Amino acid sequence: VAAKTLLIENEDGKGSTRMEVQDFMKRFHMHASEDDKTGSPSTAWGTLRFPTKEATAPYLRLSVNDDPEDALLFVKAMLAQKYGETYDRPSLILSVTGGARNFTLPPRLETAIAKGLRLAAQRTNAWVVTGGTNTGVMKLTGQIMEALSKTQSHFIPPTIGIATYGVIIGGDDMTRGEPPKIGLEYEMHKKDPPKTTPLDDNHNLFLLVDDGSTNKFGKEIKFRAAFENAAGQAFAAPVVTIVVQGGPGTLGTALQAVRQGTPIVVVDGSGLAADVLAYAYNFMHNPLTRFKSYTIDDLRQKVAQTFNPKSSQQLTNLLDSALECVQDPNLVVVYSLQESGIDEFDDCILKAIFSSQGKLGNKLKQAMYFDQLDVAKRALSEASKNGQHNEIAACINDNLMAAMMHNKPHFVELYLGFDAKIYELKPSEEVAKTNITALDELPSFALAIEELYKREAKKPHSHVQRLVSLSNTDVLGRHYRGRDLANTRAYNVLRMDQIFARLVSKDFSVNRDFTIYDSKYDKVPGIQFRRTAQASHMLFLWAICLDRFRMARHFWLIGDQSIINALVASRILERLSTHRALQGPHLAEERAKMQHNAKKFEELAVGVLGECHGSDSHMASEMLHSKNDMFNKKNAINIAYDAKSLAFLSHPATQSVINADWYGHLKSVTSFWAVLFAFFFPFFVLPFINFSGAHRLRRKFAKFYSAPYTRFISDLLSHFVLCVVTSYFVLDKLEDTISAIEWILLVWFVALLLEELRQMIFCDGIAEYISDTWNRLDLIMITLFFVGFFTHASDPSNQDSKVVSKGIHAFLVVVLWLRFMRYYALSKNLGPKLIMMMEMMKDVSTFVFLLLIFLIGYGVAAQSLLSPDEDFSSRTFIGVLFRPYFQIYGELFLDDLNSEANCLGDTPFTECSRETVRMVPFFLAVYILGSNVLLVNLLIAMFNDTYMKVQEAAEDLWRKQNYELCAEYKDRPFLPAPFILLAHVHMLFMRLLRLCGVHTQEHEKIQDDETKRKITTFEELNTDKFLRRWERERQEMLEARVKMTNDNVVQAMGMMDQLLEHMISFRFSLDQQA
C-alpha cells in the first residue's frame, strides 16, 4: 500500500510531524524542458523496484533550484517511514567519487576497499553518496554496499545516488505515473533514445536532479555537494571523500573538496588521477625513499600519460590542480595496499575523520564507532601531552555516556583510566526539578543513569519498557499502582532499585545514601571511594538491566562487596530471564543467552569464595559474617538463601561458616554427646572448656546458651520428655477423676499451642506458617490432644469415654513420635535419607496404585468364591479388605482358609463341599506371584533408579535445610517448651517495653573500620587472583588453543601472501630494472 502520511522533521530538530505525501513533496519541483526556469512541482517520486532485488528503493526527482535541506528532510522522512522515528542517525557521509567510465581494479585493493567501506558502513551507520549510475566507481560502490545489505539485518545503511535526470535511462518511464509509484519496475535493459546511462540497482535511494536538459552529465555535482554539506550540518557528521581512479573532473572535484575543507581519501593502486594525486602526495608530503625519486616533471609525465591533455597549458593547470589538491597534508589521506595494509582502509577513514574539522569529543565518538582503541588512546595521550587536559576532560563526559550507550567496555575502561571520576557523570539534558525531595536529593550521575534508561527504553521491542509497564508501582517505588512524573521521571533510580529489590525477593531491600555526594563531605577520608562504590553499584545494576555482560564485569571488578553483588546479579538475571515481561519472540535470544550469562556470575561468585578458601579460612569466616550496610545489614549467607543459590550454599567454605554459626562460635564442644554432657553438667564443664573472671565466665555461659545447638538440644530434650510422659500417660489407665499428669500435659501442650500461635500470628504470617509440613503436624497434634482431652473431660466417670480418649490419643502418640523424626535433619547421615525418602514416596504411591488393583480384584473374587451362599454385610467387606493384605506381607493364612473352606480331606484342599471352592489356592498363587515377586521388586528397581537419580540433589537440599534449620533455631526462644509460655511472659515484658512503658533500649555491635578495610582489601586481592587464574584457565583450555593457533595460521597465511606479493613486486622491479 502507498503511504499517505509521512513524518517530516521540524526546523527545531526535536520533533517530527505527520503530513501528507503531496503536501510534503510539493516543495520538490521539476523541469520539463531546458527553457523552463521555475518549472512544475514534481510528479515523479516514489518507490522503484530493481530486478533481482527484494526491496524497492525510493526515488525522488528534485529541481536544480530546489534546496538540498528539503531533500535531506525527505530522506529523513523516508528513513522515518522505513525504520520508525527512532532511526539510526549517521556519523559519516562517505562521498564515493571517481571515474564514471569502467575502472578495473586489482582484487586485493578492491577487496580491501570494499571491506573497509562495508566495515565503516556497518560500524558508523554511514550514508553513501555516489553517482548512482551502474558504471565504474558507483557500480563498485554499489557492489561494496550490496554485501552489507544482505549480511546485516534491522536498519540498513542507505546508498543514496545523486544523478542527473537527462542522462538517467527510464526517467520518462518514471515521469509517466501518478505519484507515489508504489513499486514501479525499473527496466535497465530498456532502449531509451536520449538517455543511455542506467541507474545502479544496489543504490538504496535516488536523487534525480532535473534542470530540464537531456544527455548531460555534471549537472548534479553541486546539488550532491550541497546535500552532503546539509547532511554534515544536520547530523553534525564529518564528510569523507573516497577517491578511486577518476578523471580531470574528479581532480577538480577533489580540489573543490580540499577548498571546501572536506578531507579526501585517495586509494593508491587504482590508477589514473588517484595515482597522480597519490604521486603528488608522495612528492609533496612523504619523505620516504621510494617517494624521494618522485619529481614534479615525473608527476607531469604521469599526468600526461594518464589524463593526456590537448595543450601544455592544460597539463600545467592539471599539475597545478594536483599540487593544490595535495597542498594541505591534513585534507589528503593516501591509502595503499603495499604501504598501509589489508585492514587499514577503515583506519584511513578514521585518520581522515581525525584530520577533519576537529572537535575532540566528536573524534572520540568517531573512534568509539570505528572501535580502534589504540588510536583514541594515542590521541588522548597526545592531547594530555599538549597541555589540553581541560578540553579533554570537558569532553570525556559525553564520550563516556556514548560509550555506555553504544556498549564498548574497552572504551569505558579507557575513559575510566584517563583521569575521570565515575561519580562525576552529568546528563546531556537538564532534569526538571520536582516537588518531591527524593528526586531533589538525587545527584547528576543518577540523572545520567536515568538518561541511559530513557535512551535504552526508547528503542523498539525493548524489554525495559515492558518491565516498567508491568511493574505496577509508583515513582517513589511503592507498589500502590503526577502523570508527568510518571512519564518523564519514571526511570528514576530509586524506583528502579525498588523494582530490583522486589525482583530479588519479597523481603529483599537495598539502601542507598546520596549524602556523601555533597561537597561538604569532600574532606572526609574514603568518601570518594564510597562514591565510586555506590556509582559502580548503580551502573552495575543498570548493566544487568541492559544485559551487557562485559560492562557488568567491569563495574563488578571496580566495585566493592563483589560476592554479594554477584549473588544478587545471578539471582535477578536468572529470575528476569524467566519472567512475563520478557515474553515475546523478538526478545527471544536475550531471554536465553543472558540466562547463560546469569550462570556465568554464579560460577564467578563460587570462585571468589574458592579464592577466599584458597587464602584463609578464618578471614573467609570473618568475610561471611560481615553485614553489608547497603543491604539492610544482612550477612551474605542470608543473601544466598534469599537469592536461592544452591551451588553457593553447597560449598564447604559456606558449610564451615554455617557450622561456625552453630555451637555459638565456640571451638571446644562440637560433638553431640559433648554438648549433651555440657548441657547436663553446666558448672563442671564451662569453666573447664576453652574460651571463644566471674563476668567473663558469665559471658561464656551466655555465649553457650545463646547457641542454636543448645536451644536445639533443649527443644529435643523437651520433645523427648514430652513423648516419654505422654507414653506413660497413654499406656497407664486413666482414673475416675482428672489426674495431675493430665494437668501437666494440659500445661505442656498449652505452652506448645501458645508457642505455635506466637510462631503463626506475630512472627511470620499465616500463609508462611501454613506452607510448612511440621507446623501442620504440630497443629494436628494440638487438635488430637484437645479432642482426646475433651473426650476425657466431658465424662470423667464413664469407662467408655476413657476408651474413646485413649483411642483418640493413640493418634497423638503416633503423630508425636513421628514428629520426633523432624529433629534428624541436623545429622549428616540422616537428613539426605529423609530427603531421599520424601523423593521416594512418589514411587511408594505408584506401588500402592499398582497393588490396589490386585488386592481389590483378588479380595472381591476370593471372598465371593469362598462364600457363595451369603448375604452382603459389613463383614464381607472386612473379609475383602483384610486377609489379602496380610497375604502380601507374609502371613498366608491357609489353615484358616482350609477351616473357612470346610474341606475335610487329609490333603489340605480336598474332599470339599463346593467343587469350585478348591480354586482359592490358584488365585492365591497368582496373587502372591503378582504381589511378592512382581510389584515389590519393581519397587526395588524404582528405589535404585530413584536414589541414583536424586542423591546429590538431596544433598544440596540438605545444605539448604541446614542453613534453614540454623536460621530457624537462631531465632528460637532461649527457654525450652514448658518454660516457653513463661518466656512468652518475658515477651509480654517486651510488651511492657513496647507501648505503655516505652522504655525499650536496644543496640547493635559496630565493626572496626580497619577490619572492614582489611576485608575489602582481602576481597579485592582474592577477586584479582581469581580473575587472573580464571583468565589463565580459560586460555589454557583445548578449544581456545586450537582456535588461537587457527587464527595464527590464518594471520601467518596472510603474512605469507603479503610476502609473496612483495617478492613478486621486487622480481617485477628487478625485471624492469634490467
Ligand X SMILES: CC(C)CCC[C@@H](C)[C@H]1CC[C@H]2[C@@H]3CC=C4C[C@@H](O)CC[C@]4(C)[C@H]3CC[C@]12C
Q: Given the rule CB under 6 A, which residues bind ligand X?
A: 909-910, 915-916, 918-919, 921-922, 925
Considering beta carbons, is residue 758 or 914 the nearer one to ligand X? Answer: 914
Find out whether 560 is annotated in a ligand binding site: no
Confirm whether residue 1004 is marked as ligand binding: no
CB closer to a copy of itself out of 699 and 1041: 1041
Q: H/E element holding 162?
A: strand 159-164
Least Cβ distance, residue 858 to ligand X (angstroms): 13
Query: Running DSSP on this structure, what letter comes out for residue 542?
Result: H
Which residue number, 205 or 901, has a Cβ lying nearer to ligand X? 901
Spatial separation of the C-alpha atoms in residues 224 and 231, rounded to whole Å: 10
- Closest to a copy of itself by CB, 933 vs 1060, is 1060
Residues sharing a CB contact under 8 Å with residue 136, sequence separation 6 or more, in sequence order: 98, 99, 100, 101, 102, 103, 245
> Could you say which of a copy of itself, ligand X, none residue 1045 binds, taking C-beta under 5 to 8 angstroms by partner kind?
a copy of itself
Whether 392 and 418 have beta carbons less than 8 Å apart is answered as yes
Contact 635, 626 (CB under 8 A): yes
Q: What is the nearest approach in angstroms of a copy of itself to the Cβ of residue 1035? A: 11
Q: Which residues pair with 18 in a beta bridge?
A: 7
Nearer to ligand X, 738 or 919 (CB): 919
The closest of 267, 243, 247 to 307, measured between CA atoms, is 247
Residue 1040 binding: pick among a copy of itself, ligand X, none (C-beta 5-8 Å cut-off by kind): none
Nearer to ligand X, 925 or 1059 (CB): 925
Helical axes 1009-1035 vs 617-624, angle rounded to 10°: 110
Rounded Cα distance between 618 and 656, Å, is 10
- Which among a copy of itself, ligand X, none contacts residue 515 (Cβ within 5 to 8 A by kind)? none
**Helix axis angle, 562-577 relative to 549-557, nearest 10°?**
160
The interface partner of residue 922, options being ligand X, a copy of itself, none and the CB cut-off 5 to 8 Å by kind, is ligand X
316 binds, among ligand X, a copy of itself, none (CB under 5 to 8 A by kind): none
- Cα dihedral 67/70/72/73 (nearest 10): 170
Of the candidates 1023, 336, 244, 110, the one whose C-alpha atom is nearest the C-alpha of residue 614 is 1023
- In angstroms, the CA 855 to CA 489 distance is 70
**Closest approach of ligand X to the CB of residue 918, in Å:** 3
In angstroms, the CA 417 to CA 949 distance is: 51
We find the least distance from the C-beta atom of residue 926 to ligand X, in angstroms, to be 7
CB of 929 to ligand X, least distance (A): 7
Please state, as a whole number, how many other Cβ atoms lie within 10 Å of the Cβ of residue 448: 25
Q: Closer to ligand X at the Cβ: 524 or 925? A: 925
Check whether 84 is labelled as a binding-site residue.
no
- Binding partner at 1046 among ligand X, a copy of itself, none, C-beta below 5 to 8 Å by kind: a copy of itself
Q: Which is nearer to a copy of itself, 339 or 590 (CB)?
A: 339
Residue 557 is assigned to a ligand binding site: yes
Q: Which does 487 bind (CB under 5 to 8 A by kind): ligand X, a copy of itself, none?
A: none
Residue 256, judged by CB atoms within 10 A of its CB (0-12, 13-18, 19+), counts as middle
Nearest approach, Cβ of residue 933 and ligand X (Å): 10
Please state, in angstroms and rounded to a whole number, the distance separating the CA atoms of residues 674 and 686: 11
| Distance of closest approach, residue 920 Cβ to ligand X, in angstroms | 8
Q: Give the span between the Cα atoms of 134 and 57, in whole angstroms.
A: 15
Which positions lie near a copy of itself, rule CB under 8 A?
A: 289-290, 293, 1038, 1041-1046, 1048-1053, 1055-1060, 1062-1074
Comparing CB distances to a copy of itself, the nearer of 770 and 1064 is 1064
The one-letter code for the residue type at 1010 is E
Least distance from ligand X to the Cβ atom of residue 904, Å = 13
3-state secondary structure of 805: helix
Q: How far is the CB of 903 from ligand X (least distance, A)?
A: 8
Q: How far is the CB of 1068 from a copy of itself (least distance, A)?
A: 6
Please give, one letter per residue, the 3-state secondary structure of 921-950: HHHHHHHHHHHHHHHHHHHHHHHHHHHHHH
* Least distance to a copy of itself, CB of residue 265, Å: 24
Q: Which amino acid, one-letter code, is at 357?
A: Q
Residue type, 353: I
The option from a copy of itself, ligand X, none interacting with 1043 (CB < 5 to 8 A, set by class) reads: a copy of itself
Is-contact 567 605, C-beta < 8 A?
yes
Q: Is 662 annotated as a binding residue?
A: no
Q: Which does 985 bind (CB under 5 to 8 A by kind): a copy of itself, ligand X, none?
A: none
Work out what residue 918 binds among a copy of itself, ligand X, none; the CB cut-off runs from 5 to 8 Å by kind.
ligand X
CB of 876 to ligand X, least distance (A): 22
Residue (633 or 1043) nearer to a copy of itself, CB: 1043
Q: Taking each helix axis from N to C terminus, what angle separates 589-615 and 652-661, rounded to the nearest 10 degrees? A: 60
CB of 906 to ligand X, least distance (A): 13
CA-closest candidate to residue 11, choices 69, 81, 97? 69
Q: Which is nearer to ligand X, 5 or 910 (CB)?
A: 910
Alpha-carbon distance of 1074 to 1069, in angstroms, equals 9
Identify what 995 binds: a copy of itself, ligand X, none; CB under 5 to 8 Å per kind. Answer: none
Question: Judged by CB, which is closer to ligand X: 892, or 992?
Answer: 892
C-alpha torsion angle, residues 396, 399, 401, 404 (rounded to 10): -120
Cβ(649)–Cβ(960) under 8 Å? yes
387/890 with CB nearer ligand X: 890
Is 210 annotated for ligand binding? no
* Contact of residue 915 among ligand X, a copy of itself, none (CB under 5-8 Å per partner type): ligand X
State yes or no: 756 annotated in a binding site.
yes
Render the burial of 847-860: b for 16+ CB within 10 Å, e for the rest. beebbeebbeebbb
- With CB under 5 to 8 Å by kind, the binding choice for 690 among ligand X, a copy of itself, none is none
Is 616 assigned a ligand-binding role in the annotation? no
Residue of minimal CB distance from ligand X? 918
Chain-centroid distance, C-alpha 1044: 28
> Binding site, residues?
556-557, 559, 756, 759, 775, 778, 1020
Residue list, annotated binding site for Mg(2+): 556-557, 559, 756, 759, 775, 778, 1020
Which residues are known binding-site members for Ca(2+)? 557, 559, 756, 759, 775, 778, 1020
